[PDB]
Design an enzyme around this catalytic site. Structure first.
Site, PDB file in Angstrom:
ATOM      1  N   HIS A   1       0.875   4.820  -6.064  1.00 34.13           N
ATOM      2  CA  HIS A   1       1.777   4.798  -5.056  1.00 34.13           C
ATOM      3  C   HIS A   1       2.276   5.857  -4.388  1.00 34.13           C
ATOM      4  CE1 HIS A   1       4.064   2.254  -2.241  1.00 34.13           C
ATOM      5  NE2 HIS A   1       5.193   2.712  -2.503  1.00 34.13           N
TER       6      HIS A   1
ATOM      7  N   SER B   1       6.362   3.766   2.030  1.00 34.13           N
ATOM      8  CA  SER B   1       6.862   2.976   0.903  1.00 34.13           C
ATOM      9  C   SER B   1       8.162   2.202   1.570  1.00 34.13           C
ATOM     10  CB  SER B   1       7.108   3.593  -0.441  1.00 34.13           C
ATOM     11  OG  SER B   1       8.157   2.704  -1.037  1.00 34.13           O
TER      12      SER B   1
ATOM     13  N   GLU C   1      -1.708   0.370  -5.752  1.00 34.93           N
ATOM     14  CA  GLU C   1      -0.280   0.499  -5.472  1.00 34.93           C
ATOM     15  C   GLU C   1       0.586   0.285  -6.388  1.00 34.93           C
ATOM     16  OE1 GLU C   1       0.874   1.099  -2.603  1.00 34.93           O
ATOM     17  OE2 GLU C   1      -0.578   1.293  -0.909  1.00 34.93           O
TER      18      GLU C   1
END
Ligand SMILES: CCN1CCN(C2CCN(C(=O)COc3ccc(-c4ccc(OC)cc4)cc3)CC2)CC1
Ligand SMILES: CCN1CCN(C2CCN(C(=O)COc3ccc(-c4ccc(OC)cc4)cc3)CC2)CC1
Lengths: 533, 535
Positions: free
Chosen positions: B440, B203, B327
């Site tokens: 995610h 991330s 995601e």
């Protein structure tokens, strides 16, 4: 002589001719005048009913083809000449033909009226592919086809003026439609069961008779093959029609009254010599003199009329072929030819998009390129060639057909949709063109049933299936056989299920989605973009 | 010194450290936790770049994790493991620039390749001490030397008035760079090879890794890079100097504050006061947008990330990039009406358009329409299941998958060696609803090898799967190639090229090669949408 070939219409007596179909004889009545010859002072003018005649008029011969442009790209090639005029050109051309079984039907028979295509600049009802012989013999149908003025003689308009109001070529078709109302009963036809069907510009004309109310009381059901009244090519605005007519008069040495008077003083070929020189951009699938939004015949744009019309008691049959745009690429797109396999680079693909979408801004052009690009093989010349054919096919035919079918179904109409995927064994175009624009007509008319033209046995049976589809739709409004039950029915196209069928030699296969994703781009997005410019 | 473990005392440039012997499923490991690598960025040093830690006297106890950098704490689902596993597990403090080291036990003889972890959390949260970042499994099973540092997040790490001296910006990225320098000088004392240093993050940590690639003073501190579900390019990783200045001067107003006088006022505010107003400075209602992130300052980042990956030579450079299957599903329950973790989140077409304006907050009315029609299933344009999944795909593709697809293509065409993956396995232990798929950041627990811990209730296939991923990552760190020369019986992982666009699927089944990483849809995001946004 033979009384079965002697008919009395409201204008006099006709002599038909018994023709020979593979399964039996048929009565044909070719060259019947339905209007005064629009020559001299009546050039660009609405047609008027043919005056009566004395004696027995000889209706055994195809009359003259309306004066039109003749193709010169591939001289002697069967693929292009089969659409070229097979009779002498003349502005005296408002004649129609009637096929009927032999002997004349005993009961009133549903009537199919054919309106030929040709981009509103060419075409004739006498071509071999429009031979109503087989449909009249095998299905017992009463088939009608008329000639209408094309090009400048049929659609040159100075809107508001009285000597050239526009859409007179469509008014030719309507006058033949009223002739069928007044006279087809003498041939055994039923004036209360009239089905219009046409291809390309003829399909668009059929759609405009739907959207013009004086025409609606002349037919009951419609078939639109590879053409719509809506779209980027079928119509023009009053302002653009006035621009092209004025520019055409300037190129020939010519107040509206004085301008058209000068145009009425030139040989027909003088006007044809410069009709292709008025298009505002370098284009393909764009035609100079087409129907015009005049506020009279077309009260508004076709898109506006299909968006708000009531179509509850109308039944329509619409469809496309597998490769609508492949034919048009060899008529102005660099890198394409009927002789080589037309494997194009990418720079050629974008250059061709500006020609296929001549109204697109630079941003709208890129949106098309990025949409049809295979981003895994972004330079594989085979896809970009096939994609260029799809750009022209989807933009001009497939997606206009999808929008019309959805709008009609959404507002009461009964819609049946198809895709024609069989490529004729007798085709003379290269295989990379697939099933080109207009090569389903020979099967609808039943030409494979003539043994002399060398079709396969499955093609002969395929043609019989399509003839029964079209005639069942004309008889009942439903292409499905009310005799043969059988596994797969042709379901009506609806806005929710979006069901259509495939017409090939395999049995009927029902599919859902007439290119829903790609046509959403053309019908929903791109209008908003050509607006951000 | 005297009665202690001789295997756990090490000297670094700042002094002596006492580590701790930790227990892993298959043997012990050495751990050095809470090593200070910088002077505490407190007081007059708030918003300032970090200075190196002044040496200390005596033996520093490096046996427990140090403080977590001051940050916002998530309280959308109290006591829910899906959100709690990412919350700070130590005290919040501005005194937080500390790093951790994991090595085998005893420490290796020959120099060992080094893995440096940079955590994510939208540049506003995160900590190197979270359980899912436990480097004991990679150190025990793979014999690797793993380092992870704390960097300042939020305002303390990325508030910027560009051009000024008291708040130059990117100090959170400078905290990371200072830790990479600490590794270059001191990792040899633990058995780590400073000439085989591989960065890997997720991330915002994957974005941070990418920014070290694009910043030259950092690129001399590592040799390979792994970017998991994050890129320096994209809509969220950076902000312009003018937008960073606007958000900073607005936050100063919201707390009661010439740049010098402004930042001098911000330094007098409590740390919690800046966190309480941190989220009030976003330009629009948005998800996957963060107030204070790296700024394009013409210094750390000489140009935008897009400009640098387009005009940069990367022949010298091997990267591993990839995404998870879903995601964007995580972010929908954090601002898009109709989505919740407790129901199926079936939404209407109206809620899908309302969400598109939130997921793409910079889109005009026309651009937002292009997204809606592209992601609409025109055969069922009102099916609530497809609309909910389309909303997830919009956020996931716009913020991760297509920035990653853009980054892999540019690096490969510029000479870099790129391997690409898509992580598709859903952890059997996941507490989020099934409709979120593989959310995610839920590949991290498998790459760090947590399923090896028998007490964590993973399946046996997940334990075998975790081991296979650990070898993929460590082989890439050792060789620049995730493939195994000790095993030609498994299918091979080909590099990602512009011609073939090959990537692999990471799940409970053998490696399977796929072509094109959402090529059609990402051409809309990466090629068309920028041009249309110029209107
Ligand atoms: C019923 C439909 N059939 C008749 C029409 N046929 C093609 C004829 C040539 N076409 C043109 O657009 C012509 O383009 C140009 C002609 C002349 C000049 C000078 C420039 C362009 C396209 C259609 C397809 C099948
Ligand atoms: C690196 C691992 N990742 C760390 C972050 N985690 C989720 C935390 C919460 N998220 C927000 O957007 C929160 O945004 C807001 C918070 C507070 C307020 C008031 C508004 C928005 C989404 C991501 C996913 C995994």
């Amino acid at each position: 002589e033979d009384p079965q070939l002697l008919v009395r219409v409201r204008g006099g007596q006709l002599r038909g001719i018994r023709l020979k179909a593979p399964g039996g004889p048929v009565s044909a009545f070719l060259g019947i005048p339905f209007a005064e010859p629009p020559v001299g002072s009546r050039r660009f003018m609405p047609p008027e009913p043919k005056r009566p005649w004395s004696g027995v008029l000889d209706a055994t011969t195809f009359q003259n083809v309306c004066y039109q442009y003749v193709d010169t790209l591939y001289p002697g090639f069967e693929g292009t000449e089969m659409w070229n005029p097979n009779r002498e050109l003349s502005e005296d051309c408002l004649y129609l033909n009637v096929w009927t079984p032999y002997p004349r039907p005993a009961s009133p028979t549903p009537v199919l009226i054919w309106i030929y295509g040709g981009g509103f600049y060419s075409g004739a009802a006498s071509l071999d592919v429009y031979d109503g012989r087989f449909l009249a013999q095998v299905e017992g149908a009463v088939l009608v086809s008329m000639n209408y003025r094309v090009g400048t003689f049929g659609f040159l308009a100075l809107p508001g003026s009285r000597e050239a109001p526009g859409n007179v070529g469509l008014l030719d078709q309507r006058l033949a439609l009223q002739w069928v109302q007044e006279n087809i009963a003498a041939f055994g036809g039923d004036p209360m069961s009239v089905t219009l069907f046409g291809e390309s510009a003829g399909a668009a004309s059929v759609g405009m008779h739907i959207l013009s109310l004086p025409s609606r009381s002349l037919f009951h059901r419609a078939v639109l093959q590879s053409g719509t009244p809506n779209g980027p090519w079928a119509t023009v605005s009053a302002g653009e029609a006035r621009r092209r007519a004025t520019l055409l008069a300037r190129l020939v040495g010519c107040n509206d009254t004085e301008l058209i008077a000068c145009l009425r003083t030139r040989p027909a070929q003088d006007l044809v010599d410069h009709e292709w020189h008025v298009l505002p951009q370098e284009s393909i699938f764009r035609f100079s003199f087409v129907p015009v939004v005049d506020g009279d015949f077309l009260s508004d744009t076709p898109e506006a009329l299909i968006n708000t019309g009531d179509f509850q008691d109308l039944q329509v049959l619409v469809g496309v072929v597998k490769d609508e745009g492949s034919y048009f690429l060899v008529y102005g797109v660099p890198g394409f030819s009927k002789d080589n396999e037309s494997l194009i680079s990418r720079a050629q693909f974008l250059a061709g998009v500006r020609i296929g979408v001549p109204q697109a801004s630079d941003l709208a052009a890129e949106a098309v390129v990025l949409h049809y690009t295979d981003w895994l093989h972004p330079e594989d010349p085979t896809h970009l060639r096939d994609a260029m054919s799809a750009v022209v096919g989807d933009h001009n035919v497939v997606c206009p057909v999808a929008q019309l079918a959805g709008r009609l179904a959404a507002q009461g109409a009964r819609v049946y949709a198809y895709i024609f995927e069989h490529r004729a064994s007798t085709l003379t175009w290269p295989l990379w063109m697939g099933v080109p624009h207009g090569y389903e007509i020979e099967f609808i008319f039943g030409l494979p049933l003539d043994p002399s033209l060398n079709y396969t046995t499955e093609e002969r049976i395929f043609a019989q299936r399509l003839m029964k589809y079209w005639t069942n739709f004309a008889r009942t409004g439903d292409p499905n056989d009310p005799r043969d039950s059988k596994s797969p029915q042709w379901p009506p196209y609806t806005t929710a299920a979006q069901q259509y069928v495939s017409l090939n030699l395999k049995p009927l296969e029902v599919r859902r989605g007439l290119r829903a994703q790609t046509c959403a781009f053309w019908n929903r997005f791109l209008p908003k973009l050509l607006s951000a410019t």
